[PDB]
């Protein structure tokens, strides 16, 4: 009983920590993925302003 | 950012509890019991005032420490404006 | 302010010097640790005859000078040429006069007692600084990550180290040094890239292999089925455009270069690798302190910046450590300056003032004073 | 010795005269220089309690001949640096204070309004043009106000 | 070629000095006045003590003070 | 003993699942963050090739 209780509490604390920094990995994921569609977008724009000034 | 929550508790509680006893230790030293009770009658006279002075003593200091912070608080306000003014990321 | 503004922090490396004022967030000055000596007599237009060159002017003009590195593997090997790099740092790079600035310097892990006394002799007796202090590098890196106990894997240009630190005292008998770092790593990429069918022929080809290593190199986790991935040929490849058009492609080798840090056998080294060495340092320490070190593997140094270095190390030591243990590999973003930043913090600190070795201490106690 | 130059150039016979009398009392034996011990005695008479380290540092601050002692020359140098620092502190303190008086609204600035007031508050006769003129000349960062830094600058010299 | 301009500057100075001069004299005013506030504050928070009768009073008062002290 | 054992197994399975998709959120994060230092880098390059061809 005692052993099963203690390694149970340690299973639950590792689970709780693993859920917490998972939430954090997913929020950073979302943030970086969004900053990107923005940078990649800005780029088709600077590369297309480019073939234009280069041809001119 | 919620793994840092356990840091709040530990930190705050820690520092605050440290500060407490210190204040207790300190304040305790500066305290000498009113041991003199029923040892003489005119004693109270020469005694009472001494306590009175000690009080006035402390009172006066508290007032100064006070006015001091105010002055310092103003030093800050200015020292902050010098910090912004001295920003110019140029 | 007298010295709040005034404290200098100079981190002397095998490849780079990092320098600046205690207080700043990053080094004001970063430059190669070379001293060039002209192979021929002559001048640049408008200048006089120069006996010597330091930092970037030595690198830029390398074709007419004999270049020399004062710090071999983190230890100062030539004191004539080091006093030259210091001189350059104070007077030209930071443009300060040293005789009114306290100077925090750094030394390496098992830096010989006699050296710490010699750079003190040169700081106080030839530069006449008011006060100085020598911090150990891993120790400033740790501290810059907030903590006081942990083990630092420190890796720069000529050395790698593991320095287990407990409540601030670096543990002499558990420190490991592996002489393979970013310098070795650029030269290995060089060969696997010429071996990809290329030529880094002129000096403008040589130098940029190092900029390829920094920009495009990776440390893959499961380096095994990453080679396997290379073969199916995914969009894993990466082409870099050279000083000119000459678009060079690097797909695969991109990670074969940092796999050298786990496998020294890639370069004819018989020594153990980074992760095993982290571990061995740890089973050389006291037993009761090993859970602490394991949850505090702080990384610092230019060569620990390869992305995915931390994940590979994470899994490298979990799988060597007893499962009852918590592993934790801290790798901050500013890590190429951890050492310096730890010095900036410490030296600008409110409590450090009472550890500065002053000329009063020195003129009265001899170099022994700062040596501790 | 170069320092001992301007230093003595700075002071007046009067000065030297007294700084000597003063130096003599520092010097017990009357040899010619204050020792790490002769200094300690005077310091305590002056109400301090320096430590060996502290004393030397104070000594080798003007010991150009690495003597470990101070002669009436190295001394005058020392008095001078002090004379300087003293006067500087007193100045900045006064100005600092003046700024707080002129500020009063405590926003850490001095706006054209307050500048006018304080100015008009002087006996002197002034028209708005004068006030706004002084503002324009003082306000270097052209933000309207006058920060302590600017105030230090603007008052630089004035008495 | 702005030959007169010199007089303009002197004015600012004349004024600047009229300002400082003003400052200083105002500085000590606030100073003393300040003090006045200090003695009034103290005036009521701890007025010229007047030792009571003899028995319970002296003792009582003493206890009163002593507690305030810790306060 | 029995109750503490059964809710323990259910604590461990939720922990294992929460670790698994965390690994997956972190690998996708790392991949997108890397694709980015690449796109943002490619861009300082196309924008600098640009002020250059526009000035020329
Ligand atoms: Ca003497
Ligand atoms: Ca002398
Ligand atoms: Ca104002
Ligand atoms: Ca202004």
Swiss-Prot record, chains A, F:
The superkingdom listed in its UniProt entry is: Eukaryota
Show the disulfide pairing.
none
Location within or outside the cell: Cytoplasm, Cytoskeleton
- Span list, region Disordered: 1-31
Residues modified to Phosphoserine: 38
Q: Which residues lie in Basic and acidic residues bias regions? A: 5-31
What the entry says about domains is:
The molecule is in a coiled coil structure that is formed by 2 polypeptide chains. The sequence exhibits a prominent seven-residues periodicity.
Q: What's its job?
A: Binds to actin filaments in muscle and non-muscle cells. Plays a central role, in association with the troponin complex, in the calcium dependent regulation of vertebrate striated muscle contraction. Smooth muscle contraction is regulated by interaction with caldesmon. In non-muscle cells is implicated in stabilizing cytoskeleton actin filaments.
Which protein family is it in?
A: Belongs to the tropomyosin family.
Subunit composition and interactions? Homodimer. Heterodimer of an alpha (TPM1, TPM3 or TPM4) and a beta (TPM2) chain. Interacts with HRG (via the HRR domain); the interaction contributes to the antiangiogenic properties of the histidine/proline-rich region (HRR) of HRG. Interacts (via N-terminus) with LMOD2 (via N-terminus) and TMOD1 (via N-terminus).
Which protein is depicted? Tropomyosin alpha-1 chain
Q: Organism classification, top ranks?
A: Eukaryota, Metazoa, Chordata, Craniata, Vertebrata
Q: Which residues of the full protein are shown?
A: 8 to 63 of 284
Curated annotation (Swiss-Prot), chain C:
- Gene Ontology molecular function: any one: cytoskeletal motor activator activity
GO cellular component term, pick one: lamellipodium
Family, according to the entry, reads as follows: Belongs to the actin family.
Name where it's found.
Cytoplasm, Cytoskeleton
Spell out the protein name for this chain.
Actin, alpha skeletal muscle
> Where in this protein does the record say Methionine (R)-sulfoxide is found?
44, 47
Q: How does it assemble?
A: Polymerization of globular actin (G-actin) leads to a structural filament (F-actin) in the form of a two-stranded helix. Each actin can bind to 4 others. Interacts with alpha-actinin. Identified in a complex composed of ACTA1, COBL, GSN and TMSB4X. Interacts with TTID. Interacts (via its C-terminus) with USP25.
**UniProt-annotated stretches for the region Interaction with alpha-actinin:** 110-123, 358-370
* Stored InterPro entries: Actin, Actin/actin-like_CS, Actin_CS, ATPase_NBD
Reading the lineage from the top rank, the first entry is Eukaryota
Instruction: Answer yes or no on keyword Cytoplasm.
Output: yes
Arranged from A to Z, the UniProt key words for this protein are: Acetylation, ADP-ribosylation, ATP-binding, Cytoplasm, Cytoskeleton, Hydrolase, Methylation, Muscle protein, Nucleotide-binding, Oxidation
Which positions bear Tele-methylhistidine?
73
This protein's species is: Oryctolagus cuniculus
UniProt-listed Enzyme Commission number(s) = 3.6.4.-
| The reaction(s) this protein catalyses | ATP + H2O = ADP + phosphate + H(+)
Which first-to-last residue range defines the signal peptide? none
Pfam families the record matches: Actin
Where are the N6-methyllysine modifications? 84
Miscellaneous note, as given in the UniProt record, is: In vertebrates 3 main groups of actin isoforms, alpha, beta and gamma have been identified. The alpha actins are found in muscle tissues and are a major constituent of the contractile apparatus. The beta and gamma actins coexist in most cell types as components of the cytoskeleton and as mediators of internal cell motility.
PROSITE patterns from the entry? Answer: ACTINS_1, ACTINS_2, ACTINS_ACT_LIKE
Sites bearing ADP-ribosylarginine, chain numbering = 177
Which residues does the record list as N-acetylaspartate (modified residue)?
1
UniProt enzyme class? hydrolase
- PTM-bearing positions, type N6-malonyllysine: 61
UniProtKB/Swiss-Prot annotation, chain D:
Keyword annotations for this protein, in alphabetical order, are: Calcium, Metal-binding, Muscle protein, Repeat
Spell out the GO cellular component terms annotated for this protein, sorted alphabetically and separated by semicolons.
troponin complex
Provide the residue positions that the database annotates as binding Ca(2+) 4.
Answer: 139, 141, 143, 145, 150
Any one Gene Ontology BP term: skeletal muscle contraction
Its biological purpose:
Troponin is the central regulatory protein of striated muscle contraction. Tn consists of three components: Tn-I which is the inhibitor of actomyosin ATPase, Tn-T which contains the binding site for tropomyosin and Tn-C. The binding of calcium to Tn-C abolishes the inhibitory action of Tn on actin filaments.
Q: What residues does Ca(2+) 2 bind to?
A: 63, 65, 67, 69, 74
Q: Where are the transmembrane segments?
A: none
* Residue ranges occupied by any EF-hand domain in the UniProt entry: 14-49, 50-85, 90-125, 126-159
Name by which UniProt lists this protein? Troponin C, skeletal muscle
Q: Which CDD domains match?
A: EFh
Other noteworthy facts? Skeletal muscle troponin C binds four calcium ions.
- Can you tell me which residues bind Ca(2+) 3? 103, 105, 107, 114
Q: Which organism is it from?
A: Gallus gallus (Chicken)
Q: Which family does it belong to?
A: Belongs to the troponin C family.
> What PANTHER family does the entry give?
MYOSIN LIGHT CHAIN 1, 3, TROPONIN C2, FAST SKELETAL TYPE
**Record: residues binding Ca(2+) 1:** 27, 29, 33, 38
Top-rank taxon of the source lineage equals: Eukaryota
GO MF terms listed in the record are: calcium ion binding
The reply on keyword Phosphoprotein is: no
UniProtKB/Swiss-Prot annotation, chain E:
Family note: Belongs to the troponin I family.
What's the stated role of this polypeptide? Answer: Troponin I is the inhibitory subunit of troponin, the thin filament regulatory complex which confers calcium-sensitivity to striated muscle actomyosin ATPase activity.
The record describes its post-translational modification as: The N-terminus is blocked.
Describe the protein's quaternary organization and the partners it interacts with.
Binds to actin and tropomyosin.
Question: Organism's domain of life?
Answer: Eukaryota
Q: Where is the stretch described as Involved in binding TNC? A: 1-45
Entry protein name: Troponin I, fast skeletal muscle
Where the shown chain sits in the full protein? 4 to 74 of 183
């Amino acid at each position: 009983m005692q052993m099963l209780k203690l390694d149970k509490e340690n299973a639950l604390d590792r689970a709780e920590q693993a859920e917490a920094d998972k939430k954090a990995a997913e929020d950073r994921s979302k943030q970086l993925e969004d900053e990107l569609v923005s940078l990649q977008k800005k780029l088709k724009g600077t590369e297309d302003e480019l073939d234009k000034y280069s041809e001119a | 950012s919620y793994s840092s929550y356990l840091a709040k508790a530990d930190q705050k509680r820690g520092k605050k509890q440290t500060a407490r006893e210190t204040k207790k230790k300190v304040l305790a030293e500066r305290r000498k019991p009113l041991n003199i009770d029923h040892l003489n009658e005119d004693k109270l006279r020469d005694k009472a005032k001494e306590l009175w002075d000690w009080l006035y003593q402390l009172q006066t200091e508290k007032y100064d420490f006070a006015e001091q912070i105010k002055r310092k608080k103003y030093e800050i306000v200015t020292l902050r404006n010098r910090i912004d003014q001295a920003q110019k990321h140029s | 302010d007298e010295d709040e503004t005034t404290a200098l922090v100079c981190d002397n490396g095998s490849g780079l010097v990092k320098a600046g004022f205690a207080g700043d967030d990053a080094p004001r000055a970063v430059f190669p640790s070379i001293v060039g000596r002209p192979r021929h007599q002559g001048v640049m237009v408008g200048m006089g005859q120069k006996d010597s060159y330091v930092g970037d002017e030595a690198q830029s003009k390398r074709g007419i000078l004999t270049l020399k590195y004062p710090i071999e593997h983190g230890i100062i090997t030539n004191w004539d040429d080091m006093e030259k790099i210091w001189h350059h740092t104070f007077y030209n790079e930071l443009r300060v006069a040293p005789e009114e600035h306290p100077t925090l310097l750094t030394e390496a892990p098992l830096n010989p007692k006699a050296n710490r006394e010699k750079m003190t002799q040169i700081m106080f007796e030839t530069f006449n600084v008011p006060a100085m202090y020598v911090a150990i590098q891993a120790v400033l890196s740790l501290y810059a990550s907030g903590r006081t106990t942990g083990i630092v894997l420190d890796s720069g240009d000529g050395v790698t180290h593991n320095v287990p630190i407990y409540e601030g005292y670096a543990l002499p008998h558990a420190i490991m040094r592996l002489d393979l770092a970013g310098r070795d790593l650029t030269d290995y990429l060089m060969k696997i890239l010429t071996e990809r069918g290329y030529s880094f022929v002129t000096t403008a080809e040589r130098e940029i292999v190092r900029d390829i290593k920094e920009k495009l190199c990776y440390v893959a986790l499961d380096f095994e089925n990453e080679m396997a991935t290379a073969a199916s040929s995914s969009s894993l490849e990466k082409s870099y455009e050279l000083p000119d058009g000459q678009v060079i492609t690097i797909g695969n080798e991109r990670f074969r270069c940092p796999e050298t840090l786990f496998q020294p056998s890639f370069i004819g080294m018989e020594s153990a690798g980074i992760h095993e060495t982290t571990y061995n340092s740890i089973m050389k320490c006291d037993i009761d302190i090993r859970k602490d070190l394991y949850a505090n593997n702080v990384m610092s140094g230019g060569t620990t910046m390869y992305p995915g270095i931390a994940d590979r190390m994470q899994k490298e030591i979990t799988a060597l450590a007893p499962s009852t243990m918590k592993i934790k590999i801290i790798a901050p973003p500013e890590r190429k300056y951890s050492v310096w930043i730890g010095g900036s913090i410490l030296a600008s600190l409110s409590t450090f003032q009472q550890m500065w070795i002053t000329k009063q201490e020195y003129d009265e106690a001899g170099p022994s004073i700062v040596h501790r | 010795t170069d320092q001992q130059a301007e230093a003595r150039a700075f002071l007046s016979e009067e000065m030297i005269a007294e700084f000597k009398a003063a130096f003599d009392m520092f010097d017990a034996d009357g040899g010619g220089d204050i020792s790490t011990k002769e200094l300690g005695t005077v310091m305590r008479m002056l109400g301090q309690n320096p430590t060996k380290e502290e004393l030397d540092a104070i000594i080798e601050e003007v010991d150009e001949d690495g003597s470990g002692t101070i002669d009436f020359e190295e001394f005058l140098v020392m008095m001078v640096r002090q004379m300087k620092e003293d006067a500087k502190g007193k100045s900045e303190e006064e100005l600092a204070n003046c700024f707080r008086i002129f500020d009063k609204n405590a926003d850490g600035f001095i706006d054209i309004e307050e500048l006018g007031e304080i100015l008009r508050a002087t006996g002197e006769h002034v028209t708005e043009e004068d006030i706004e003129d002084l503002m324009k000349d003082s306000d270097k960062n052209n933000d309207g106000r006058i920060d302590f830094d600017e105030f230090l600058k603007m008052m630089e010299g004035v008495q | 070629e702005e030959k007169k301009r010199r007089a303009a500057t002197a004015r600012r100075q004349h004024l600047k000095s009229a300002m400082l001069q003003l400052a200083v004299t105002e500085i000590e005013k606030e100073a003393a006045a300040k003090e006045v506030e200090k003695q009034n504050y103290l005036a009521e928070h701890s007025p010229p003590l007047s030792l009571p009768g003899s028995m319970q009073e002296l003792q009582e008062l003493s206890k009163k003070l002593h507690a305030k002290i810790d306060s």
